[PDB]
Amino acid sequence: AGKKVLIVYAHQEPKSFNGSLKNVAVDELSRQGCTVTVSDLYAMNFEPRATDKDITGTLSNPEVFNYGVETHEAYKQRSLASDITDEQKKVREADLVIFQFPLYWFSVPAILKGWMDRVLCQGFAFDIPGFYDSGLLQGKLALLSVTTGGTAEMYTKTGVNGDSRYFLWPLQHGTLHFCGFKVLAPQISFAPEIASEEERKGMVAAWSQRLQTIWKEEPIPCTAHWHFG
Amino acid sequence: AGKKVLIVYAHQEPKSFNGSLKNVAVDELSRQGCTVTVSDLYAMNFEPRATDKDITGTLSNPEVFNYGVETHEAYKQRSLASDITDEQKKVREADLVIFQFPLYWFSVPAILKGWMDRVLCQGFAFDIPGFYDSGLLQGKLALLSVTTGGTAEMYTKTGVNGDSRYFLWPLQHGTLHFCGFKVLAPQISFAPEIASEEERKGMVAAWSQRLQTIWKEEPIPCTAHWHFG
Numbered sequence: 004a005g006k007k008v009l010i011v012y013a014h015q016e017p018k019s020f021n022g023s024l025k026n027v028a029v030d031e032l033s034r035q036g037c038t039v040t041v042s043d044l045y046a047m048n049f050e051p052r053a054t055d056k057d058i059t060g061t062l063s064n065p066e067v068f069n070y071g072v073e074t075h076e077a078y079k080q081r082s083l084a085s086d087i088t089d090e091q092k093k094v095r096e097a098d099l100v101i102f103q104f105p106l107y108w109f110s111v112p113a114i115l116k117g118w119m120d121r122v123l124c125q126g127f128a129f130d131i132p133g134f135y136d137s138g139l140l141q142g143k144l145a146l147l148s149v150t151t152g153g154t155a156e157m158y159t160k161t162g163v164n165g166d167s168r169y170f171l172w173p174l175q176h177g178t179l180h181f182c183g184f185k186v187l188a189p190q191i192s193f194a195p196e197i198a199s200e201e202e203r204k205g206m207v208a209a210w211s212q213r214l215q216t217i218w219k220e221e222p223i224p225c226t227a228h229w230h231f232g
Numbered sequence: 233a234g235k236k237v238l239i240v241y242a243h244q245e246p247k248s249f250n251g252s253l254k255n256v257a258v259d260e261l262s263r264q265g266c267t268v269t270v271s272d273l274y275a276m277n278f279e280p281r282a283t284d285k286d287i288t289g290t291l292s293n294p295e296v297f298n299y300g301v302e303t304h305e306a307y308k309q310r311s312l313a314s315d316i317t318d319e320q321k322k323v324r325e326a327d328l329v330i331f332q333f334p335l336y337w338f339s340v341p342a343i344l345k346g347w348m349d350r351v352l353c354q355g356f357a358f359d360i361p362g363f364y365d366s367g368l369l370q371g372k373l374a375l376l377s378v379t380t381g382g383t384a385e386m387y388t389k390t391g392v393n394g395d396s397r398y399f400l401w402p403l404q405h406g407t408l409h410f411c412g413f414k415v416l417a418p419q420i421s422f423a424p425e426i427a428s429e430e431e432r433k434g435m436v437a438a439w440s441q442r443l444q445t446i447w448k449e450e451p452i453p454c455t456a457h458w459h460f461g
C-alpha cells in the first residue's frame with residue numbers, strides 16, 4: 004500500500020551499466036505498484052559544494068562562516084536553498100532510498116558526496132541527541148547499489164583492494180546509520196567493464212530478481228563486526 | 233633542500249581551525265626554505281563534477297559518454313580542461329601533497345572529493361600496470377590533516393564511531409597509495425569545536441612542531457593490517 008522509493012542516481016551516461024541498473028529498478032518497482040522517484044544528479048547539474056549560497060536569509064554570524072551551524076539554523080528557519088529542500092522532500096516521503104553509482108576512489112562520485120553533504124543537514128537527518136539508532140530518518144530503509152572497476156576476487160580480505168565491506172563503512176555506518184537508516188545489504192555489481200555479455204546480463208537479472216522481494220528483507224547489523232570482523 | 237609542497241585546502245572560512253592549520257603549514261614550510269603552493273578549493277570555486285566538460289575539443293566517442301576512457305585519451309592527447317591540468321602541474325612538481333579538510337560524513341568534503349575524481353586521472357596518477365607501489369606518483373609523499381567533530385574516545389575500535397583508521401582506508405589506501413604515494417601518518421585534530429582554548433592551541437602547536445621534521449618521517453605501512461588489525 005503506497006511504498007515510496009527514491010533512487011539517487013550518479014552517472015553521466017544513460018546507456019551505461021548504472022543506467023541499466025537504474026532503469027531496471029524503476030521498471031520493476033513501478034510494475035510492483037510502488038511509487039518511484041529518481042534524482043538524476045548529473046542531469047540536474049546538482050550543486051555539490053557546501054557554501055554560504057545554501058542559506059538565504061540572515062546569517063547567525065556573517066563575519067565568521069560556519070557551514071554546519073548556519074545550515075542547522077536555516078533548516079529550522081526554512082531559509083535553506085530550495086534544491087536542498089526539494090531533496091529533503093523526496094527523502095522524507097521515501098520508505099526506501101536506493102543509491103545507484105559507480106565506485107569512485109573507494110567511495111561515491113563527488114556529485115553524490117555533495118548530495119550527502121548538503122541534504123543530510125542537522126535538524127533534518129540527525130540531531131544532538133538523535134543519531135545512529137535515534138537518527139531522524141529512523142523507520143526508513145537505505146540500500147547501496149554500486150558498480151566497481153575491480154573484480155570480486157580483488158575485493159577480498161587477501162586481495163589487493165581488501166574486502167569490499169571495508170569501503171562501505173563510511174557510507175553505511177558513518178552516514179546512513181548515523182542518520183537513523185536501517186541498511187539493507189549492498190548490491191555490488193563487480194567489474195561490468197570486463198565481464199562477458201552473459202555475466203553482465205546475469206548481474207542485471209540478479210538485481211531485478213532481488214527487487215521483487217526487496218520489502219521482505221531484513222537490514223544488516225550495521226556494526227564494526229559486520230564490516231571488519 | 234629545495235623541496236616543493238602542495239597544500240590542497242577545503243574549508244570555506246579563513247578564520248576557521250582548518251584555516252589556521254593551513255596558514256601554519258604555509259608559514260612553517262615557507263620559513264624552512266621550502267617551495268609552497270596552496271589550492272584553495274572553495275576560493276577557486278573548484279568544479280567537483282566529473283562531466284564531458286573536462287575534455288576540450290571533441291570526444292573520442294560522442295554518442296556514448298564514458299568518463300574514464302575519455303579523460304584517459306584526453307590526458308594522452310593533452311586536451312583536458314585547464315583547471316584539471318593546472319592541478320596536475322602542481323602535483324607533478326610536488327614532493328609532498330598535504331590535504332587539509334574537515335571530516336564530512338567519514339570522508340572528504342565533496343569539493344575535495346571532486347579534486348580527487350577529476351585530477352587523479354588515468355595516465356597521470358595510475359595506469360595498467362602502474363598502481364599501488366608502482367602507481368605513477370611513486371616518489372611523492374602525501375599527508376591527510378583532518379579535523380573532526382567527534383572526540384578521540386568516540387573514534388576507538390569499541391566506541392560509537394569505530395577506529396579513526398577505519399575511515400582513512402578509502403583515502404589513504406584506495407586513493408593515495410593506489411596512485412603510488414607513500415602516505416605519511418595522518419594528522420588528526422579531534423573535535424576543536426568543543427576543545428578549550430588551551431587544547432586548541434596545543435593541537436595547532438603539535439602540527440607546527442611536526443612540520444619542523446616532516447622530511448625525516450618514514451611513511452606508514454599502508455596495509456589492511458595497519459588500518460584494521
Ligand SMILES: Cc1cc2nc3c(=O)[nH]c(=O)nc-3n(C[C@H](O)[C@H](O)[C@H](O)COP(=O)(O)OP(=O)(O)OC[C@H]3O[C@@H](n4cnc5c(N)ncnc54)[C@H](O)[C@@H]3O)c2cc1C
Pocket residue numbers: 018019020021022023104105106107108109110150151152153195196200203204207298299300349350406
Ligand atoms: C574517477 C573514477 C574513480 C574510480 N575509482 C574506482 C575505485 O576506487 N575502485 C574500483 O574498483 N573502480 C573505480 N573506478 C571504476 C568504476 O567504478 C567503473 O568503471 C564503473 O563502476 C563501471 O560501471 P559503468 O556503468 O560506468 O560502466 P559501463 O562501461 O557503462 O558498462 C560496462 C559495459 O556495460 C555494458 N552494459 C550497459 N548496460 C548493459 C546491459 N543492460 N546489459 C549488458 N551490458 C550492459 C556497457 O554497454 C558495456 O558493455 C573509478 C572510475 C572513475 C572514473
Ligand SMILES: Cc1cc2nc3c(=O)[nH]c(=O)nc-3n(C[C@H](O)[C@H](O)[C@H](O)COP(=O)(O)OP(=O)(O)OC[C@H]3O[C@@H](n4cnc5c(N)ncnc54)[C@H](O)[C@@H]3O)c2cc1C
Pocket residue numbers: 053069070071120121177243247248249250251252333334335336337338339378379380381382424425429432433436
Ligand atoms: C556536512 C558535514 C559533515 C560532517 N561529518 C562529520 C563526520 O562524519 N564525523 C565527524 O566527526 N564530524 C563531522 N562533521 C563535523 C566537522 O568535521 C567539524 O565541525 C570540523 O572538522 C571542525 O573544524 P573547523 O575548522 O570547521 O572548526 P572551527 O569551528 O573553525 O574551529 C573550532 C573553534 O576553532 C577555533 N580556532 C580557530 N583557529 C584557532 C586557533 N588558531 N587557535 C585556537 N582556536 C582556533 C574557532 O575559532 C572556534 O573557536 C561534519 C560537518 C559537516 C558540516
Ligand SMILES: Cc1ccc(-c2cn3cccc(C)c3n2)cc1S(=O)(=O)N1CCNCC1
Pocket residue numbers: 108109151152153154157164300301352353354359360363406410
Ligand atoms: C582498486 C582500484 C582503485 C581505483 C581505480 C580507478 C580510479 N580511476 C580513476 C579514473 C578512471 C578510472 C577508470 C579509475 N579506476 C580502479 C581500481 S580497480 O580495482 O578497478 N583496479 C585494479 C588494478 N588495475 C586497475 C583497476
Ligand SMILES: Cc1ccc(-c2cn3cccc(C)c3n2)cc1S(=O)(=O)N1CCNCC1
Pocket residue numbers: 071072123124125131134177181337338380381382383386393
Ligand atoms: C559520527 C559523526 C557523523 C556525522 C557527524 C556530522 C554530520 N554533520 C552534518 C552537518 C553538520 C554537522 C555538524 C555534522 N556532523 C558527526 C559525527 S560525530 O562524531 O561528531 N558525532 C559524535 C556524537 N555526537 C554527535 C556527533
Ligand SMILES: [Zn+2]
Pocket residue numbers: 175176177180181224225226
Ligand atoms: Zn552502523
Ligand SMILES: [Zn+2]
Pocket residue numbers: 404405406409410453454455
Ligand atoms: Zn595502502
